[PDB]
Ligand binder design. Structure first.
Ligand SMILES: *[C@@H]1O[C@H](CO)[C@@H](O[C@@H]2O[C@H](CO)[C@@H](O)[C@H](O)[C@H]2NC(C)=O)[C@H](O)[C@H]1NC(C)=O
Ligand SMILES: *[C@@H]1O[C@H](CO)[C@@H](O[C@@H]2O[C@H](CO)[C@@H](O)[C@H](O)[C@H]2NC(C)=O)[C@H](O)[C@H]1NC(C)=O
Ligand SMILES: O=c1ccn([C@@H]2O[C@H](COP(=O)(O)OP(=O)(O)O)[C@@H](O)[C@H]2O)c(=O)[nH]1
Ligand SMILES: O=c1ccn([C@@H]2O[C@H](COP(=O)(O)OP(=O)(O)O)[C@@H](O)[C@H]2O)c(=O)[nH]1
Ligand SMILES: *[C@@H]1O[C@H](CO)[C@@H](O)[C@H](O)[C@H]1NC(C)=O
Ligand SMILES: *[C@@H]1O[C@H](CO)[C@@H](O)[C@H](O)[C@H]1NC(C)=O
Ligand SMILES: O=C(O)CCC(=O)C(=O)O
Ligand SMILES: O=C(O)CCC(=O)C(=O)O
Ligand SMILES: [Fe+2]
Ligand SMILES: [Fe+2]
Ligand SMILES: [Fe+2]
Ligand SMILES: [Fe+2]
Ligand SMILES: [Hg+2]
Ligand SMILES: [Hg+2]
Ligand SMILES: [Hg+2]
Ligand SMILES: [Hg+2]
Ligand SMILES: [Hg+2]
Ligand SMILES: [Hg+2]
Ligand SMILES: [Mn+2]
Ligand SMILES: [Mn+2]
Lengths: 700, 700
């Protein structure tokens, strides 16, 4: 048994990037002892992500190996740091190195890089990996010193080509006992073997398994175009996320705060924008520390922004609006907003937030700042769907692709802070990162690609982690696909696409509590029920939408009412079918009226069928009342739409068979009474002003 | 001005028949002085109604004229008595006789009788009647004596031929100044001038007018085949019936009573016969003075007669039944019943009463006896139609014909006791008339004609008046046209043909009082109404008609009920459509349920549409209860059909939304509740016996 204290891990890292700090955490988890070479110098190895290079690593290693040139007692493993995570203990590592019977064991991959012509000089291996990879090797300190001493080349010369030619020496291969980890018992290179690697979970740690050779490797190396696939594995291995302990680096359980530059973007006609602008005042963060930027590209929202701006300017420390007259594209506006924080040393954090993002958690800004990340984003999903503000993986064309754990994250099966290749809609960026690591202005613009895809690619090219947190419920995304903007109040027609937001704005706030009972629903007349249904904003926008139509009912209008022996009981009304709002009102009946009816009438079941839906107008100048009659319906929904006293003086409904009078109608409330036989109801006269009501004859 | 005291009316009458007593009343009305010849002797004039004769009249007249042979001061008018009524005063009579300038004025007719060949010897008249009629003449006593003295012929020789030949003497016509009343200024002969005579009404008397000559005759003579047409006029002229004083001889305003022979005839399957037999016990007349005869020709009524016979035999003085086994035709049975009174000197009055006659007036037998007629009949009309138990006139074939005043009598515009040519169904005949005037037994039988037509013709041939009284409301006639006798209770199907009798037998006795309000209808549950609808006999015969069908509902029977979200709420029931009683029950809903619904639910209007009508059976052995559900109807009719306690132990209906229970159903009563939404009703379990209910789902 080789003593673990005789093991030394040597790596090269010119800066403490996120990939390096991720490597060190996996090393400190297994109690490895790591010596890092080159933390202060600059990288002279060229552009190793693009072409050949990395000779500066061997030069620093040769200088380091001169102290251990005669140390036969020391085992030394050299691995990369930016794209390597450790999945195994030193004891298992040394045990597997002894079983190999090699004095210097290199890693093996599927490609002969960089010179493909040397593929013949390699020995024939049956089913394992054939060629050498310099990204990770382990061996005796003396045998390594006899190899790394021969390096006398430029800093920008390929390091793997140097180790390959020394391995391809048949004599030197036999003398020093050089071998390649063919079946990935210690080193796992991902390039060319992506389908071979899967995760293997345990109670409090995670490893990887090579299903092609049935091995549990120790070193996971994301060489080449597999850096994203390693970020996926790095979210778990070794203790990134565990089934019993949860994630390992997130905050989980949670005097001036940092100054923030909030940047709102309205790049398309967005529903419920006045609700979004009113929510900016409610974010739980000291507003005197927030500087607001807002870019509105739509002229449809200029009145919305103007109504909210006096409150925004008085709330935040500073505000600035860039309206549609500047003719700014989405890429140019996001560059400008981000650069305003970059060029200000007082901007400690940058918070971009699109208009279609609804922040239900008012502490979102704090939560993301406490996570202490460079780029972190809150998880926002479309209500009841898998669509969300992040991607789990990329296609070969760097477009969308579903990751193996994408659904587990959206459904919040596994919770934590995840390294993901794409974020959007909302994210918090550290101010230092914008000045030190992405100082250029062309972050979103520059190339013919989506400004949002270029923003994420600009951070991946610099080795920045795009974090995504689903540790808490942050909010949801709106549906802006087909937003019909040609209405006096287009948010009324948003009951299908955004029902959760439609309910908060239009349905009465006490409706849901009334549906659960507890003494809200009243019974003013024997079989007439009274419950709150619509909000004051719903009543106002519906009345205004009717008057904006203008063409009310006059002579020769027939409503399905019953008086005496004829159906000649008219009203001055407008049907929902005339304004193109029939399907939208039927959906209100199915979702909110139907369930309320079956609760108040035990045994009755509705599908909320209704062919007669209309708004009645009562005025002393034209039809101020309605003579007694029956309704052609099983039950009738009678909803007021304005105030008694402020808008009209006059009675409401009167049921003759009971001598019961509804003399004081409530604005947002609704009446639910049977239409036939027992409820001969009469409309009391309106003496002053105008009285509006919404009425549907349900289940005829 | 000739003194009226010098006028003498001489007539011939061998017996005080009804036609003679009618003549004397018209004569005593105008204060005429009449001398009647031959009241004691027998008629030797032959058969004047068939052929020629009447010479015995001239012989008695010649003997009478010998005292007034020299009386120039005396005017004398000779007329018949059986077929003559006086319409004018003596003053008007003498005045018109003076204006004629004749010493002996004969009556004129349209036919030369008996010898038609003598029509040429008559003088030419332009437009009036040409030939002589011996039925009535007026002249001086001396001139008449010089004519009647020449009579020296047999008693059976024609009298008109004698007066005609004396008139056809041109010399004697000029000497004695003989003339004919051509234009009917005094004498009106009806034969050959029927269309010329109409009635002329006044305040307190009636006359006749000859519209062909515009005259008001004094003597109305029904010569030849016009005796019935005179009976019509005799009902008014002169004071028979007046528009201001009503009829003149009827009783109008009303110690042992006479003994009566009551004869009931059942010659066809008649509805409501048990009701008729129970009514015979209720006739207001001392039953110890009534002898009952009953002829039943239908075996269908043998059980009906047998059930009532113990009560009939114990009620009347004597009873006798002649059932269907005797094989008696209707003519033979009516001859036998009438002859049983004829051959009994203790039978003072004979009362025939058919089965289809419903006597609503319990004092009918008294009323007709107080009228003191030979043959009188109470007026009975089909309900709401003109069909009744009498004819107003006859056709030339002695079949039915409508008289001029037939509709005024049926509708009781004119009321009184009327001389009509035909009666049926019910009539009272004096016992003396059967012994003295119609002693033969073949009254109804004998000739190939209807036994009812031969009965009336047998009385007209003897000069008997067939009286008909509509002075009071006596009753009605049943409809026995198409009586479907193939049912366990055929009177259930009699709601269309005899609705007034159907209502008294089957509809609850307190239904009509409840329909007028006044605290009979109850409201046990908020919108559930409780009123009496059916009688105990209706419930019993309907249940028995269901069990007589036998095929109740078991598995896979679906009634239009609503529970949860399916219509799978069955019952053990039988629909009215299965027993051929759907149309009959729909008529009950329209006539009796509908009006009750519109009274209890002000504003609702029904036509009593119902596709689901059925009788439910609840038993502990099969389906003792019914789980909560709704009904596919606007309102539901729930009628009990038996007694709680005597037939079943178990609850009734339960409405869950009100916690109201109908624990004690009433047999003939009905429940009226809405079917949808508010009345989730549940059928309580039947613990013992059997529970029947009738239920209709009205207005679906
Ligand atoms: C919904 O219900 C709540 C409580 O039932 C209402 O809150 C009350 O509102 C009245 C008038 O605005 C106040 O006088 C009370 O003090 C409130 N109660 C509480 C506990 O705050 C609320 O107004 C209802 N919503 C609407 C739209 O009427
Ligand atoms: C119809 O109503 C009358 C009166 O409302 C009922 O007559 C009463 O009947 C009860 C029980 O039979 C007697 O105790 C009372 O004395 C009766 N009242 C009178 C004034 O006679 C009659 O019973 C009802 N008919 C039915 C079929 O129930
Ligand atoms: O600017 C640099 C670039 C490279 N490296 C080190 O050189 C190694 C080679 O980089 P890379 O993993 O991208 O090469 P590959 O494994 O893809 O061949 C990295 O792991 C780093 O440890 C460094 O320290 N600074
Ligand atoms: O049995 C008789 C038949 C005849 N007459 C009298 O004779 C008259 C002639 O009868 P009738 O009127 O029927 O003859 P017609 O007028 O039809 O020629 C009657 O009016 C009676 O007054 C009579 O007294 N007894
Ligand atoms: C690492 O070493 C520490 C001693 O400082 C020890 O407490 C811990 O259990 C070790 N962990 C592993 C995984 O060896
Ligand atoms: C008939 O004579 C009586 C006298 O007894 C007289 O009272 C009556 O008015 C007279 N009637 C007529 C109609 O002449
Ligand atoms: O004004 C009212 O409440 C009665 C109007 C009504 O119910 C109807 O529209 O039929
Ligand atoms: O027994 C009852 O009264 C309930 C039965 C009923 O209402 C039905 O037939 O649906
Ligand atoms: Fe309308
Ligand atoms: Fe209404
Ligand atoms: Fe049924
Ligand atoms: Fe029912
Ligand atoms: Hg190579
Ligand atoms: Hg993006
Ligand atoms: Hg109202
Ligand atoms: Hg003649
Ligand atoms: Hg008859
Ligand atoms: Hg009941
Ligand atoms: Mn690498
Ligand atoms: Mn005559």
């Amino acid at each position: 048994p080789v003593n673990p204290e005789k093991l030394l891990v040597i790596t090269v890292a010119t800066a403490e990037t996120e990939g390096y700090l991720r490597f060190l955490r996996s090393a400190e988890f297994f109690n490895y002892t790591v010596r890092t070479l080159g933390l202060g110098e600059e990288w002279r190895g060229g552009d190793v992500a693009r072409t050949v290079g990395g000779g500066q690593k061997v030069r620093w290693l040769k200088k380091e190996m001169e102290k251990y040139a005669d140390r036969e007692d020391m085992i030394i493993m050299f691995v990369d740091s930016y794209d390597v995570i450790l999945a195994g203990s030193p004891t298992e590592l040394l045990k597997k190195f002894v079983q190999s019977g090699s004095r210097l064991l290199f890693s093996a991959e599927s490609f002969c890089w960089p010179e493909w012509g040397l593929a013949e000089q390699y020995p024939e291996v049956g089913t394992g990996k054939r060629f050498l990879n310099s990204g990770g090797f382990i061996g005796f300190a003396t045998t390594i010193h006899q190899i790394v001493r021969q390096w006398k080349y430029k800093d920008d010369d390929d390091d793997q080509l140097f180790y390959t030619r020394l391995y391809l020496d048949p004599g030197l291969r036999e003398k020093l006992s050089l071998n390649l980890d063919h079946k990935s018992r210690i080193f796992q290179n991902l390039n060319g073997a992506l389908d071979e690697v899967v995760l293997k979970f345990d109670r409090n740690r995670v490893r990887i398994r090579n299903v092609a050779y049935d091995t549990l490797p120790i070193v996971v190396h994301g060489n080449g175009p597999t850096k994203l696939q390693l970020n996926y594995l790095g979210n778990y291995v070794p203790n990134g996320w565990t089934p019993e302990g949860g994630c390992g680096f997130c905050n989980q359980d949670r005097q001036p705060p940092p100054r923030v530059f909030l940047a709102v973007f309205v790049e398309q006609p967005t529903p419920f924008l006045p609700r979004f602008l009113q929510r900016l005042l409610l974010l739980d963060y000291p507003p005197d520390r927030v500087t607001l930027f807002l870019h509105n590209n739509e002229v449809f929202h200029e009145p919305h922004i103007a109504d909210s701006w006096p409150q925004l300017q008085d709330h935040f420390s500073a505000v600035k609006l860039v309206g549609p007259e500047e003719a700014l594209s989405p890429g140019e506006a996001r560059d400008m907003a981000m650069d305003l924080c970059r060029q200000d040393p007082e901007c400690e954090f940058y918070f971009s937030l699109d208009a279609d993002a609804v922040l239900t958690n008012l502490q979102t800004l704090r939560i993301l700042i406490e996570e202490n990340r460079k780029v972190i984003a809150p998880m926002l999903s479309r209500h009841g769907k898998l669509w969300s503000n992040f991607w789990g993986a990329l296609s070969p064309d760097e477009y969308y692709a579903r990751s193996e754990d994408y659904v587990e994250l959206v459904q919040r099966k596994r919770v934590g802070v995840w390294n993901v290749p794409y974020i959007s809609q909302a994210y918090v960026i550290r101010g230092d990162t914008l000045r030190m690591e992405l100082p250029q202005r062309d972050v979103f613009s520059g190339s013919d690609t989506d400004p949002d895809m270029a923003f994420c690619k600009s951070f991946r090219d610099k080795g920045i982690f795009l974090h995504l947190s689903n540790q808490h419920e942050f909010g949801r995304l709106l549906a802006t696909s087909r937003y019909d903007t040609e209405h006096l109040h287009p948010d009324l027609w948003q009951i299908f696409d955004n029902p959760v937001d439609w309910k908060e704005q239009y349905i009465h706030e006490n409706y849901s509590r009334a549906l659960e009972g507890e003494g809200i629903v009243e019974q003013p007349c024997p079989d007439v029920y009274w419950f709150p249904l619509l909000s004051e904003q719903m009543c106002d926008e519906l009345v205004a939408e009717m008057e904006h139509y203008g063409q009310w009912s006059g002579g020769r209008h027939e409503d399905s009412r019953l008086a005496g022996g004829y159906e000649n009981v008219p009203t001055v009304d407008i049907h929902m079918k005339q304004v193109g709002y029939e399907d939208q009102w039927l959906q209100l009946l199915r979702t909110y009226v139907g369930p309320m009816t079956e609760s108040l009438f035990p045994g009755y079941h509705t599908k909320a069928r209704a062919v007669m839906n209309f708004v009645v107008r009562y005025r002393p100048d034209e039809q101020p009342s309605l003579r007694p009659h029956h309704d052609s319906s099983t039950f009738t929904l009678n909803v007021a739409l304005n105030h008694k006293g402020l808008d009209y003086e006059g009675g409401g409904c009167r049921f003759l068979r009971y001598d019961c009078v509804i003399s004081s109608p409530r604005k947002g409330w609704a009446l639910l009474h049977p239409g036939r036989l027992t409820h001969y109801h009469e409309g009391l006269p309106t003496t002053w002003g105008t009285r509006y009501i919404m009425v549907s004859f349900v289940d005829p």
